[PDB]
Amino acid sequence: PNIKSAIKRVKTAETRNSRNASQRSAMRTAIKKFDEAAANNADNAKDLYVEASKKLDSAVSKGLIHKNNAARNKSRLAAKL
Template sequence: MPNIKSAVKRVKTIEKRRALNASQKSALRTAVKAADQAVVATDVDAAQAALINATKKLDKAVTKGLIHKNAAARKKSRLAKKLNALSAQA
């Protein structure tokens, strides 16, 4: 445990930040997984809605510094590719 007052404050703020980041990252993973499952279920309308939600969360995560912009772009691209393949089949 730190002895210096500023170090004690940093520990508190870092813990708050870590908890917030963890919850946001969890919500992001849930949204991406929901989009994937909607594609697997071959429900085009639900998949489109889930893709929009996942895209929003990915973009937000990039601006917050949770994930790298290329990682977000890769995930969005893969989800869109799956949705486009599903739409072509229907």
């Protein structure tokens, strides 16, 4: 880059990329664990389900997911049990 603002913007870009990737990976792993539990047997599943929804709701407060996305995922994975 050859503008003093572009370098700061790109640095902030890598920082935000790392942060958002970490939280998104955590949320996907929680969803994966819940759907693995729900697909096979019953076991806790529902006990997992709650915190899975948590991983979505807090994510909306972070700003890395739309509110409609969180509601849609919660409703769609709530139909497994």
